[PDB]
Every structure is written in C-alpha cells, then in structure tokens.
Structure 1
C-alpha cells in the first residue's frame, strides 16, 4: 500500500528474513498519533522514489512483544534493517532526517535524479 502494515511478531520475523538482502525501513506507529500521519505521508513518497527499499509500518501498541524487544517507547520510531540486523534508528517525526538516513543506506542508483512535486 506504499506502506504495508505488519500485524504480528511472526509476520515481522518473516519479513526480516524475506528482505534480508535489501534495506528495510520500519515505522513503529500509532493510528492516533498525528506525528505518524505526517510521517506515513513521507514514507509513501520515499517508497515511490526508492522501490529497492521496503517501507512498512508496525503498530507499536498492537505488536508489543516486537516493541519491547526493540525498545520502542514512543512513536514514530524508525528502525533500519539489513540482513536481520538493526543498522540505524530515528526517533521522532523528523522528515528530512528520515530521508537523509534512507539515502545514506540505500544503494547508489536506487533513485532517479529528480522527483516530481505537487505545486498547488
């Protein structure tokens, strides 16, 4: 859905395995948090610019065993994974910084030189 939702520890474990050879960005989110509404929109734009990268969301309160493992006490928290290892983290709704970390970890050539903007 641009940003697929992971609904259980089992699905998360499988996802990490499936996506081992590429970058995976996980937005730990809450459906009541305006921070996360802002950042889901950012994640959807990233997802279009970087189809090599997997962008998913996981409801922190809905999968609490995963949240506890990864020390998720607030949302948004973004975790970055390659080969089932956490390689980076961002706490809070900081759009430019999310994008900077994604660009740092994404492969060279993963994006075109420009992105279309909506000017209204």
Structure 2
C-alpha cells in the first residue's frame, strides 16, 4: 500500500512499521505534472506487490527528508531495508523498478 510522508519523524516510524520486507521510496514531486505522470506506474504496484511496502515523498512539503538523502533530481527511487539504505537509482524508468526489486527481493 503506497504511503505519503510529511515529515522526518514520520519517515522514521514508516520504516519501523514496515517490518523488514523491502521498503522502496519514490522521491518525486506531487504538485508537478510530468513527475506525477509516472505515478500510474509506481502507484500501481500497490495492488501488484502486496508483500512489499511503497512510499511516496513530496519534495515540496518534505524537503527535510529529501535533503536527508541528498537528492538533486526527481524522480529518485530509493531502497530501504530494516531502516537501512541498500540500493538507490534515479531516472524516469519503470521497467527498471521491477527487476530492481527482484534485486533485493
């Protein structure tokens, strides 16, 4: 189930309530258009992969979290596990998310 973050204190609990299963994050802009044009791709995995947790950070109201990952270009996909970063790749690519998840699955 995709989840939207709003602050850092939250970004923490999310990784604490996500158990240990893969935890992929979508650092992109929700207000922008072209950035949300790739949503029907990362937001559709909500029902497909029910064994994985997905998040969605808004680099507009959650710059604290973004500035935490030192991002400098959206959309940026990150991979967190047990609350520890293990993979991260940016670029408007979808066919990659799949195989990528198959990486740490």
TM-score (norm 2): 0.88
Structure 2 counterpart of 1:102: 101
Q: How far did residue 87 of structure 1 move?
A: 0.8
Taking only aligned residues, the RMSD between alpha carbons, in angstroms, comes to 1.5
Structure 1 counterpart of 2:20: 21
Larger Rg: 1
Structure 1 counterpart of 2:53: 54
Structure 2 counterpart of 1:43: 42
Q: How far did residue 23 of structure 1 move?
A: 0.7
Q: Residue 36 of structure 1 contacts residue 93 of structure 1 at CA under 8 Å; is this kept in 2?
A: no
Structure 2 counterpart of 1:7: 6
What SS does the corresponding residue of 1:74 show, helix, strand or coil?
Answer: coil
Unaligned stretches of 5+ residues in structure 1? 107-120
CA distance in 2 between partners of 1:73 and 1:33 (Å): 18
Q: How far did residue 33 of structure 1 move?
A: 4.1
Structure 1 moving runs of 4+ over 6 Å? none
Please state if 1:74 is matched with 2:73: yes
What SS does the corresponding residue of 1:28 show, helix, strand or coil?
Answer: strand
Structure with greater contact order relative to length (CA < 8 Å, sep ≥ 6): 2
Give deviations 1:47-103, integer Å, cap 9, x for gaps. Answer: 222111011100023211211111111111011111110111120111111111112
TM-score (norm 1): 0.78
Structure 1 counterpart of 2:87: 88
